[PDB]
Design an enzyme around this catalytic site. Structure first.
Site, PDB file in Angstrom:
ATOM      1  N   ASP A 132      17.000  24.259   7.257  1.00  9.71           N
ATOM      2  CA  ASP A 132      15.580  24.828   6.894  1.00  9.71           C
ATOM      3  C   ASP A 132      15.379  25.414   5.378  1.00  9.71           C
ATOM      4  OD1 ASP A 132      16.144  28.463   8.542  1.00  9.71           O
ATOM      5  OD2 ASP A 132      17.782  27.163   7.537  1.00  9.71           O
ATOM      6  N   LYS A 135      23.724  33.912  13.564  1.00 14.56           N
ATOM      7  CA  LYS A 135      22.483  34.456  14.166  1.00 14.56           C
ATOM      8  C   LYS A 135      22.425  34.594  15.306  1.00 14.56           C
ATOM      9  CE  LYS A 135      20.411  31.239  11.960  1.00 14.56           C
ATOM     10  NZ  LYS A 135      19.236  30.231  11.308  1.00 14.56           N
TER      11      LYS A 135
HETATM   12  O1  GLC Z   1      17.594  30.482   8.846  1.00 13.88           O
HETATM   13  C1  GLC Z   1      18.190  30.947   7.627  1.00 13.88           C
HETATM   14  C2  GLC Z   1      19.697  30.811   7.647  1.00 13.88           C
HETATM   15  O2  GLC Z   1      20.194  31.474   8.747  1.00 13.88           O
HETATM   16  C3  GLC Z   1      21.842  31.384   8.649  1.00 13.88           C
HETATM   17  O3  GLC Z   1      22.212  31.839   7.244  1.00 13.88           O
HETATM   18  C4  GLC Z   1      22.278  29.946   8.894  1.00 13.88           C
HETATM   19  O4  GLC Z   1      23.855  30.056   8.768  1.00 13.88           O
HETATM   20  C5  GLC Z   1      21.724  28.978   7.669  1.00 13.88           C
HETATM   21  O5  GLC Z   1      21.825  27.623   7.771  1.00 13.88           O
HETATM   22  C6  GLC Z   1      20.252  29.206   7.618  1.00 13.88           C
HETATM   23  O6  GLC Z   1      19.683  28.467   6.571  1.00 13.88           O
END
Ligand code: GLC
Ligand code: TK1
Ligand code: NA
Length: 446
Positions: free
Chosen positions: A191, A155
């Site tokens: 999360d 991200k």
């Molecule tokens: O925030 C949503 C997701 O973002 C990205 O996919 C991260 O790698 C993952 O851990 C998280 O759950």
């Protein structure tokens, strides 16, 4: 023809069933010892297990790192009817500096521990030694509920020398090297995991968590015998699929468009997180922007003339996607977004931009539906049940707030999941309540 360019985003039912089967195949690869290490879908055991091995009550500290804003909050957990209630009581949000997030691990966790203090002092409580739950929204290989190394940032995160390191360590150092306060760090969860946990009191069928926000991921309760990387055949453990990286081994190659390729090439993490790049709000506004640029270079939009802002990376915000598709038909919202971007759109320009928005976001809903249906149908098979009744806890701004995403998404998952009856629950303070409830169970050992 604009319609011909936009038609490239469509996915037929058979395209979706194909995506779904391939996701199921990658999920199976990630769970098996012989393939887990090469698997694009990592399927990370999380050490969160079924059944209530008692829960402590009281107050818990919750950290939430996974966006440009970091959150610190206090949650009070208590006993009751069904079991344990939870409720956010105190909360504070913090933006991370530009040069803090591009600093180092040791440094970023210092800014974080610093922020825990601005919260602790500012709430009459630096003297407290609270149990801490850390929601950390990045892929982690766990050794345990309180131990695990970050595999890589996603991200657009980039703090150096954080990859490969026990993330709970990094946090407990910033706590030592601050002198300020003492906190006991009892659990780190993803999360997706927190969101599911947060709905479980209200609904014991909640055994999947899904985030559709800046990034896109899900977790669910797997059979312990299927989880080959943790010893034991008894009960269930939560698996963090990390499905964002589905396609990083070429599984989506036949679907990717010139727009996807360009978003990927100019991203912080090229070649990685390719499924997530089709869906997440970090990328959805950028996709529309590139589609708009294509339309204009072909003289089909803005009479072939694009503003300075429109030719800048990041300028078409994902929130604009959602606002464009909330336009009531009078073109006012569309016009006002575009005009702010230094554009002077016509009636037909507005309508085209709306169409570009619908195409990107419909394809994200459908693409996401194939991922989830793959998870639900796997679980229906694993549990050997005729009609599977399951709850999915969900969070994230794309899902919650884009005007039509949820409805298109629900219709499409239900289509791909015969003999499953899926209940969707949007979580209320899922991160913080979720990390708190895990914490409170992790506090039966100590
Ligand atoms: O925030 C949503 C997701 O973002 C990205 O996919 C991260 O790698 C993952 O851990 C998280 O759950
Ligand atoms: C009382 S209650 O019934 O209201 C209630 C009970 C549990 C609640 O959250 C949990 C916290 C947990 N901490 C650990 C843990 C932690 C460390 C090691 C191993 N395990 N495992 C947990 C599982 C849950 C619930 N859970 C499931 O069992 C399936 C899907 C799900 O969310 C929420 C409400
Ligand atoms: Na096992």
């Amino acid at each position: 023809m604009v319609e011909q360019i936009l038609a490239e985003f469509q996915l037929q039912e058979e395209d979706l069933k194909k995506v779904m089967r391939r996701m199921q195949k990658e999920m199976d690869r990630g769970l098996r010892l012989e393939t887990h290490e090469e698997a694009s879908v990592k399927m990370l055991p999380t050490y969160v297990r079924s059944t209530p091995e008692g829960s402590e009550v009281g107050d818990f500290l919750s950290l939430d790192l996974g966006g440009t804003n970091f959150r610190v909050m206090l949650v009070k957990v208590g006993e009751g009817e069904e079991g344990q209630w939870s409720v956010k009581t105190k909360h504070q949000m913090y933006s991370i500096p530009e040069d803090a997030m591009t600093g180092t691990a040791e440094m970023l966790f210092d800014y974080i521990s610093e922020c825990i203090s601005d919260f602790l002092d500012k709430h009459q409580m630096k003297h407290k030694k609270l149990p801490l739950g850390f929601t950390f929204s990045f892929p982690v290989r766990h050794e345990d509920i309180d131990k695990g190394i970050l595999l890589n940032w996603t991200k657009g995160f980039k703090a150096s020398g954080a990859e490969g390191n026990n993330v709970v360590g990094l946090l407990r150092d910033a706590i030592k090297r601050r002198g300020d306060f003492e906190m006991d760090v009892v659990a780190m969860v993803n999360d997706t995991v927190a969101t599911m946990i947060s709905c479980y009191y209200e609904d014991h069928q909640c055994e999947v968590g899904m985030i559709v926000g800046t990034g896109c991921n899900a977790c669910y309760m797997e059979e312990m015998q299927n989880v080959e990387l943790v010893e034991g055949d008894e009960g269930r453990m939560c698996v963090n699929t990390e499905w964002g990286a589905f396609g990083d081994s070429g599984e989506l190659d036949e679907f990717l468009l010139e727009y996807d390729r360009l978003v990927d090439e100019s991203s912080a993490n090229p070649g990685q997180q390719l499924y997530e790049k089709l869906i997440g709000g970090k990328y959805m506004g950028e996709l529309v922007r590139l589609v708009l640029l294509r339309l204009v270079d072909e003289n089909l939009l803005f009479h072939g003339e694009a503003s300075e802002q429109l030719r800048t990376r990041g300028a078409f915000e994902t929130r604009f996607v959602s606002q464009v598709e909330s336009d009531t038909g009078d073109r006012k919202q569309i016009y006002n977004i575009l005009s702010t971007l230094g554009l002077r759109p016509s009636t037909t320009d507005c309508d085209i931009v709306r169409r570009a928005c619908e195409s990107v976001s419909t394809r994200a809903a459908h693409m996401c539906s194939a991922g989830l249906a793959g998870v639900i149908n796997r679980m229906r098979e694993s549990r050997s049940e005729d009609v599977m009744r399951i709850t999915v806890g969900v969070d994230g701004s794309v899902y919650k707030l884009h005007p039509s995403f949820k409805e298109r998404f629900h219709a499409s998952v239900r289509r791909l999941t015969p003999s499953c009856e899926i209940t969707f629950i949007e979580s209320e303070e899922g991160s913080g309540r979720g990390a708190a409830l895990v914490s409170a169970v992790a506090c039966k050992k100590a």
